[PDB]
Amino acid sequence: TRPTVRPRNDVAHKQLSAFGEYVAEILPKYVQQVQVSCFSELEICIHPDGVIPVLTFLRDHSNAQFKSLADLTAVDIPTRQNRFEIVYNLLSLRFNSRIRVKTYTDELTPVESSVSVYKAANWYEREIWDMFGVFFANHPDLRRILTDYGFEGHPFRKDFPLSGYVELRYDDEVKRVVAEPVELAQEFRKFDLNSPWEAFPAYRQPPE
Amino acid sequence: TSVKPIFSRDMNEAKRRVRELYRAWYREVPNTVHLFQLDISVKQGRDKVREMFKKNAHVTDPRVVDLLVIKGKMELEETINVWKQRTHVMRFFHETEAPRPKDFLSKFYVGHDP
Amino acid sequence: TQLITVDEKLDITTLTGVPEEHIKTRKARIFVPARNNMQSGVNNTKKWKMEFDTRERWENPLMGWASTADPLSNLVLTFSTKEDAIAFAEKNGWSYDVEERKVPKPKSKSYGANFSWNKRTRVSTK
Amino acid sequence: LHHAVIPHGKGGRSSVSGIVATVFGATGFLGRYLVNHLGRMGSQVIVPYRCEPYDTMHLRPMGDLGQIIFMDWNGRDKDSIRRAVEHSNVVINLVGREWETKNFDFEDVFVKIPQAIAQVSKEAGVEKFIHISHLNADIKSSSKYLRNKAVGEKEVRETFPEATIIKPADIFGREDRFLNYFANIRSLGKKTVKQPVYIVDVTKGIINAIKDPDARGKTFAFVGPNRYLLFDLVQYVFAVAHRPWTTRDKVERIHTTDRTLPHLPGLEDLGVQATPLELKAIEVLRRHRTVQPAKTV
Amino acid sequence: LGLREIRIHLCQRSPGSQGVRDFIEKRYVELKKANPDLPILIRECSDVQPKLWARYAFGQEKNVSLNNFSADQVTRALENVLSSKA
Amino acid sequence: GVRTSPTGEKVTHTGQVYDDEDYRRVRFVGRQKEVNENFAIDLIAEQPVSQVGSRVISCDGGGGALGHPRVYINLDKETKTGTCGYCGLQFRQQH
Amino acid sequence: ILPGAAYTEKSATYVNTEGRAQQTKVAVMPPGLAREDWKIIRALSEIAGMTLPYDTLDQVRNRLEEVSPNLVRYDDVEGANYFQQASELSKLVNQQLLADPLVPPQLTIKDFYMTDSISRASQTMAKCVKAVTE
Ligand SMILES: NC(=O)C1=CN([C@@H]2O[C@H](COP(=O)(O)OP(=O)(O)OC[C@H]3O[C@@H](n4cnc5c(N)ncnc54)[C@H](OP(=O)(O)O)[C@@H]3O)[C@@H](O)[C@H]2O)C=CC1
């Protein structure tokens, strides 16, 4: 498996598993899962009440020092009853390492804003308000950042269509750019691409 | 059934926030018609405010009406600060849109939609 | 305390920005998609799908393209179970209907049955 | 009915309204808003233009792709009229000048060219023909405008007997020559009574006259909801505008009272609620700003 | 102006339909012999409650719940239908 | 191999032409309907049938890697020639 | 003539020979000015001044449940009892058997391909009939 296969990094896998045990036993109040992928990335799946206690810890513990918030993300998985998955990506420049802190919410449960831990988050979770509708409590200035000012709905939800519900055109009667219910001259052609054969038997789910 | 609140513990505090938001919109509407130099009246903009509040009047969940007050305050903050243009304020008034057929018969005449 | 009790039915239709025309006139369909009979694989019959009723597609006068006015025309949602799809349809106010999962029943196979002494299940060729 | 002209869609920009319109005089004040209101339903608008193509550019965002066909024409060339109308199912005439020129008098613009358009539209098989007269069109009128427009109305009626002939009184809008004439005059007040009609009301009247099969062969009178004396109307215009090119034929039409024709149907018989001038005069005359309403009769 | 059809909805297995079931096993046949040109549509279904629809002239329909009735009560409701004719 | 409808409109290699009572001819008024006049169904019929001495022939369209994928055409039927499914070149067993 | 929707053009309840009610879905829309069938009948009833008490498809199906509630229980065969009582009613009138032998209207594959208005308007079915007759 030399030329074309990605070489597995076992040292980083061992170190991230050990540090994941470390985080899981320092913070048992909030940590729900700890996992390490085959390409050696550590995910710490926590309860949403511990956004501030975990992320401060990783920012301030002498064996963590995750002083950088690389990215903050939501993922909409509608079959989960807590359909939004808030993903923090942290960088420790001291220990040259990355950690992922994942948590959950639905449309109505507010996540605590992490601006007091990382100020970097100030726009990012603001984007999570704009794209997903996840509310962040105790945010300094929570409002839309990317959508238009009269925009209704949250676009990166997966029950939101690819085109919107409204589209703009200039109207010469009212002398104004106006919004109208969307009509496409060519509908977006949905392609059903998934093969009916199983691709990865290592990821086979057990039947009912 | 035990959920985490947003601002309001029940519907009384929630209706209080709805009521303060309606007060703020009612106060803002003449300034909006002036500085955007809209071609509507203050009565008409306040009727659109009342229409947007009474559209959501069927809701019995405190968290949903908390988020509705949050989004109404975001709309008002984008209107007081001149962040909307005239176009975004007048998108509430569907002026260029043709009136939809409302009865069964004209919806039968124009097409396939229920 | 820091928790409140809401006994109400979950409804987020006022928050999702969806126009009312595409809430109370659309029929969500919750179903496991049938296996494509061009093929023997079953990996597409594993999950539940929520689709909607198809609306009018017409001919574009310029190019002949399929013009639509339906925003929910390409919206297919994927769910692990039936109850997740039903909870998601009820959460969004979509009137739905549910087809049950149709599995193939357990067949009784025997290669020796192709060569019976007295039964009609003999093969005449192989 | 042909399969390409059956209406489809929900009546938006990419829809098909089933209306194939040849709008003569689409580059004017009325043609602007008529081609706007047609192009937003998804109508095949044919715009024959006389002018520079630059002066037609504002008509281009009004419809979807291929839904406005611009083509050259000439009033004294019937071949170009046939080249414009032979595919349409409706032909709307909006050709007009407030002044007579070196090459086109009032008889050319109001008698010759509408009769030519209506005759070539009759012989090409066009289903619907709409012609726009003026409310005060009279044979014994004091102004040559109204005399030639009455003669042209009579000729259009006798050469296309199913022509919907429409009488607007005085049309106001952002590009009018009625309130913008009074705002830029800085002539007097007389016993002249006027009821001015709004341009979107006239445009909705023309489109509802296209859609109505009862409007064939009728004559409609599009008037405003309120009759004003000329003096307090002009004072209301100078009041809204924050104030303290012409010809004598224009002055003869300003001092012509808008006649009352109760036997002709109006905007309400096409389903248009006529907008009063106090709702739209601020929208028209906001540009002239560097108010108690007028009295009706 | 007159009765036009009778519709009897019932379950196959619910106990509330039991008397309705006992109405059909014994008393339907001489019912149908007495009204040979009257459509008495018996409609069994899975988990419905028993019901007696009477359709009259010009589309008018009356509705009698036959739930938990004995066969005599079903007989009396049905003969009230046959004798009323509103 | 173009021909013309009674409206004076050219018929494409597909066979598309608008009707007389179709309004959509107005798009070519003052302009032109652009058709391609090299119909491929007439051009491939000008190619002579290749006589070969084998039972199965291979065809890649000519040019090697510049043609189509190389397919194998059987030539057992003497009633019909064997046509390339990509290029349309036809072959006959000469025996 | 009232142009109606075909079975691919409407969501529509059909019941097979074993009593199983089923529903089509809309695949394409009816061409031109053609409409769904009960929409046409309901619009006619509103023009005639005897407006039927339904507006949407769910309300039609509520009426359809009112007339027989097994027409809204999809992919469900409902058991039908009472063979004894129908057989006792069948013994009343003694209709006489004719001397004509039982001949089905479809004897060969020739008569299979065209039975209704969709199959007779098919060119594929015409090619099938022309192939099996030669
Ligand atoms: N208040 C009003 O304006 C009223 C108007 N009407 C009638 O409604 C119609 C439209 O009015 P309105 O919009 O104000 O008119 P405009 O003056 O704004 O424009 C008239 C149109 O006709 C075209 N046109 C004029 N003369 C000729 C000609 N000799 N040959 C070819 N085209 C010509 C112009 O084209 P181009 O751009 O090339 O000059 C222009 O597109 C007219 O017939 C007018 O008489 C009736 C009652 C009231």
Ligand SMILES: [Zn+2]
């Ligand atoms: Zn080849």
